[PDB]
Ligand SMILES: CCCCCCCC/C=C/CCCCCCCC(=O)OC[C@H](O)CO
Ligand SMILES: CCCCCCCC/C=C\CCCCCCCC(=O)OC[C@H](O)CO
């Protein structure tokens with residue numbers, strides 16, 4: 001392929017595909033209703049990402065957006081992926097702590113605003129307005145991070161020890177990895193253009209695989225996903 005970033009899109013496609021297959025074989029035979037919920041949510045995440053990394057590799061999920069004079073290559077398929085996978089990841093954390101319906105709706109709604117305004121900012125043609133949408137999307141993300149710390153952590157500390165310890169590890173992983181996304185976007189091709197697209201694609205690939213495959217490896221190997229039975 002003539003695009004220098006193709007090597008990272010192909011590695012991303014392969015790793016998401018291998019991750020999906022591993023979780024699929026692993027979830028076979030699980031009869032506990034609670035564990036089936038976590039396996040279903042956690043296997044769909046890499047399956048969706050696989051299809052959208054493939055679409056970028058083949059060129060379907062790419063568009064040209066004029067801003068700053070030149071034509072800029074914008075991979076819109078990322079936002080179709082994140083629209084469906086980031087809510088599912090939040091659902092994994094909320095069900096682990098047995099969150100209430102009201103708090104779950106708050107997280108999913110703010111997540112939808114995060115991704116939706118990020119997409120609008122990505123396709124905006126007036127350069128200075130791109131950063132207005134970036135700001136609003138980052139405000140929605142800070143609300144999500146606030147709820148995970150000053151809401152879920154308080155309840156996790158009144159549950160089973162395995163639930164509290166597993167949640168604390170996954171909460172920490174989420175806060176660090178998610179926080180990197182607005183930074184890469186800001187200095188990358190969608191924003192200031194300080195980092196070239198080939199390096200930007202490499203960074204997102206490392207973050208995406210860690211946040212979906214690595215996240216799932218820690219969750220599905222813990223005993224917190226199974227109900228307390230004899
Ligand atoms: C799990 C085990 C795997 C661990 C893997 C962790 C690696 C993460 C990669 C990071 C960024 C790489 C940045 C490389 C930047 C190269 C850009 C460059 O030097 O270009 C020069 C330019 O032409 C003139 O300034
Ligand atoms: C090279 C391989 C490429 C990557 C693979 C192609 C992915 C796209 C195809 C299919 C969906 C397959 C099923 C995905 C849904 C899994 C949900 C699940 O397994 O849930 C378990 C639960 O316990 C049950 O009751």
Ligand SMILES: CCCCCCCC/C=C\CCCCCCCC(=O)OC[C@H](O)CO
Pocket residue numbers: 044048051080084
């Ligand atoms: C818990 C529920 C799980 C639900 C899981 C649902 C997964 C469907 C996701 C993705 C493939 C992306 C489809 C993107 C559609 C693009 C359509 C299109 O045509 O692009 C616009 C324009 O027309 C182009 O030229």
Ligand SMILES: CCCCCCCC/C=C\CCCCCCCC(=O)OC[C@H](O)CO
Pocket residue numbers: 138179180182183186192194
């Ligand atoms: C908790 C998560 C926080 C997420 C939100 C954190 C936002 C702060 C980021 C960036 C401003 C960086 C500088 C912007 C000005 C760009 C002009 C410029 O000087 O280029 C960059 C320079 O070469 C090299 O720093």
Ligand SMILES: *C\C=C(C)/C=C/C=C(C)/C=C/C1=C(C)CCCC1(C)C
Pocket residue numbers: 082085086114115118119134137138141177178179181182185207208211212
């Ligand atoms: C599939 C993996 C994860 C962790 C995806 C995370 C995506 C975000 C946290 C997106 C953040 C954005 C914000 C807050 C502002 C700029 C636009 C983005 C959509 C990249």
